[PDB]
Design a protein around this ligand. Structure first.
Ligand SMILES: O=P(O)(O)OC[C@H]1O[C@H](O)[C@H](O)[C@@H](O)[C@@H]1O
Lengths: 464, 454
């Protein structure tokens, strides 16, 4: 029988004091690194507007260039015949500046406080996109300026990820980490969707706003995370977590490599991100050549892949918990990838009905072990049981496991440009050549993990 | 030590639990009653739609018969020459059953608990109002349908105000004043200022969705109240507040009969501007249909400024009637000057209209506290709960007859001329100033002691 207390208040009463702060931090870390991606996005949207052919527009007065030169509807010095070399030389001066910047940000992230460092690593990321956006509103036509901004936009956005998993690893414990980090990784897709939808508004007109509006949203979130961030549970009298008297000093970069898993899970992720990039480079150069249906959907099937990543994580969390093996799940999910690329290649003769049901499963099998390794394996191998509690190593291990995975994407457009003139099918065999290297590199850790299972189950569970 | 607390956490960890539980209710009651006011506004903003002149109108294919219609751009029981009289048989047919409803709910308002009676009053007042717009899609042309939906909408929507002041009056004292209450009383103006913007979108087009959208938002705020509202602080156990027939036949004491005929005028002034101003701007101003409705929202920022300034001044000057008499005696020179020009660009329809809104809706929210401040001090003391509630019921029951003579009277004075309405709104404003001399004569004697000791 219903009585005097309201249903919403009776539901919200039953949660304890800790389970509201530990849900607050799981919301703020969801907002911050989702506001990073809509800053990273818009140059992959305005890349078809800095050059286009001038054969379908109005002809107001400019009858000088023999009525057609394709030189006036193209804005920048990306105007002449090499609009694919110099325009492609911006996403190398961002990725080199971002994959070098991670191994120094992981060293800086230890010593300085994580509220005066995530704030000054988000205002500068709102400034160095807005200075790029102001190149249209000013009289700017060069080459070195547009790349010297996009280098300094790459040393700044590396303050996001190690500080975020340091702020999350300080609260949660040994328990449901995989199933909660897998649900929590939805920000990498929410940021992509809201970074395409904002920058798609002002792309067919004046293109300065697509870099200024995310550059203001990021700087506003930079002061909200200034005013409401609680890094430690000790400050608000909560309970310290359960990673199974005063502040530990530090750790140096030479000492963090002696943790036994930090090299294999580093080096596998370079190949996992390379697979997940070269597949997305292979898919537009497939459906527009063979299986000619849905030529306009190539800009859509690239993101319906990415949704398959999210369910690729959560299902790869529920298996990682109740087996207590993280290397023995990430290896199997990449064994199952190679019998699904070939079956999609075989089944693409049919239409959309196969090209969704295979694409979702492929996204579940190759963005799974990226998502599980980049946030849950990279936090318990940070606070390993070999540190004896007197070493603060969580913003430095994440830098290694992420700064390998960014080098893994910096070599993406290079190897996808130095084999792609040799046919167009030959880029696909590199994916199968890389999945075998992804699988066979975790062998030592799977060899350790299986003999731990053989003690507790095949013997008969003696002295548990 | 090294990293201190955040400035938004160090600030929020200074407020007591009592302050958060008495802030939650001052937010929830605001968002309840603001959603009651926007169920009432779009019958005022759509009267500029039910009768268009078909002479000045684009005629593509809309001829069902030529030379004998002249009415195709009009709705059917509001198309004749009496379209300004039949709107007063609808808008008064609402405001009658809102008065007879509140005269009864002030007696039989205890047989159900507060939240089960408030959330069954935002759920049937969101149904009987979206039927008024759903009559468009079922396109019935009958005067009989636009009345029973309007007389039953008033009998439900009387469950708003008797069941908010006993939800606040338990938590934040048993009748309090101050600056936080001066902002809480702005809900009756915000519920009109956003009842015009939302319901003005679908006017030039299909006017069914000018009703069904607020009828959905009220019915959804009939669920958040059903799940989150707390009646008494005996349940969550916070700190209790600051503990501080024909009954004599229209009392011969110098209160009731010389005061009751003041709310009857000071509500008749403001409901004419609530139900006939977006037809004033639409008719004899710049000839819009939606912009004329949108310039009606600058009448309801005067209704905020005149609330805030009156609540600020009347506390620090030891008198509440002397901020009502002066602000009623000055609206009458200004409304006449507003009708004098009214058309010379959007310069004098912007700045004159706000200050005409600050001089008539400011003292709309104070002269009901003046009688409760003065008429607790009588030979019938505050211990007589059987009569101190009864005389306030008499005053507020005359106040609800003050609604039903505004839009009824405007709808009859309007077809005989349109300049005449701003003369009835002068003959009703100065008489509001005249019948507060009972309070002013006490106020002068109250200041005489401070002048003698000073
Ligand atoms: O019935 P409404 O027009 O919404 O008025 C609601 C309330 O507004 C103000 O607070 C008045 O001072 C009250 O007397 C009135 O009851």
């Amino acid at each position: 029988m219903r009585s005097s207390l309201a249903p919403g208040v009776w539901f919200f009463r039953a949660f304890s004091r800790d389970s509201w702060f530990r849900g607050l931090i799981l919301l703020l870390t969801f907002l911050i690194y989702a506001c990073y991606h809509m800053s990273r996005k818009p140059i992959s949207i305005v890349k078809s507007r800095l050059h286009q052919n001038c054969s379908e527009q109005i002809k107001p007065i400019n009858d000088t260039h023999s009525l057609n030169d394709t030189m006036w509807c193209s804005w920048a010095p990306f105007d002449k015949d090499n609009y694919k070399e110099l325009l492609g030389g911006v996403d190398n001066a961002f990725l080199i500046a971002y994959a070098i910047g991670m191994f120094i940000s992981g060293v800086f992230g230890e010593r300085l406080p994580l509220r005066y460092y995530l704030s000054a690593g988000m205002l500068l990321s709102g400034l160095f996109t807005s200075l790029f956006g102001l190149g249209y509103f000013w009289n700017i036509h060069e080459l070195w300026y547009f790349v010297v901004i996009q280098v300094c936009n790459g040393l700044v956005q590396t303050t996001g990820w190690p500080s975020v998993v340091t702020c999350v690893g300080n609260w949660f414990g040994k328990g449901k980490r995989g199933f909660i980090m897998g649900i929590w990784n939805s920000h990498t897709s929410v940021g992509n969707i809201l970074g395409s939808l904002i920058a798609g508004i002002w792309v067919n007109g004046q293109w300065g706003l697509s870099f200024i509006v995310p550059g203001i949203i990021t700087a506003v979130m930079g002061v909200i995370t200034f005013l409401f961030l609680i890094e430690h549970p000790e400050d608000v009298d909560c309970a310290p977590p359960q990673h199974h008297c005063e502040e530990p000093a530090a750790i140096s970069f030479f000492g963090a490599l002696r943790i036994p898993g930090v090299v294999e899970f580093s080096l596998c992720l370079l190949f996992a991100k390379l697979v997940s990039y070269t597949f997305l480079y292979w898919l537009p150069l497939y459906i527009a050549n063979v299986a000619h249906f849905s030529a306009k959907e190539a800009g859509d099937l690239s993101t319906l892949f990415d949704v398959g990543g999210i369910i690729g994580g959560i299902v790869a969390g529920l298996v990682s918990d109740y087996t207590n093996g993280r290397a023995t799940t990430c290896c199997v999910m990449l064994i199952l990838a190679a019998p699904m690329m070939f079956l999609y290649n075989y089944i693409g003769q049919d239409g959309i009905a196969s090209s969704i049901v295979m694409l979702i499963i492929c996204g579940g099998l190759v963005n799974g072990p990226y998502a599980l390794i980049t946030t849950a394996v990279s936090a318990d191998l940070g606070t390993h049981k070999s540190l004896k509690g007197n070493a603060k190593a969580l913003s430095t291990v994440t830098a290694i496991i992420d700064g390998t995975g960014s080098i893994g994407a910096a070599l993406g457009p290079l190897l996808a440009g130095l084999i792609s003139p040799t046919g167009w099918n030959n880029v696909f065999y590199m994916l199968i050549s890389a999945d075998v290297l992804a699988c066979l590199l975790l062998c030592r850790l799977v060899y350790k993990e299986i003999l731990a299972w053989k003690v507790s189950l095949s013997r008969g569970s003696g002295y548990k």
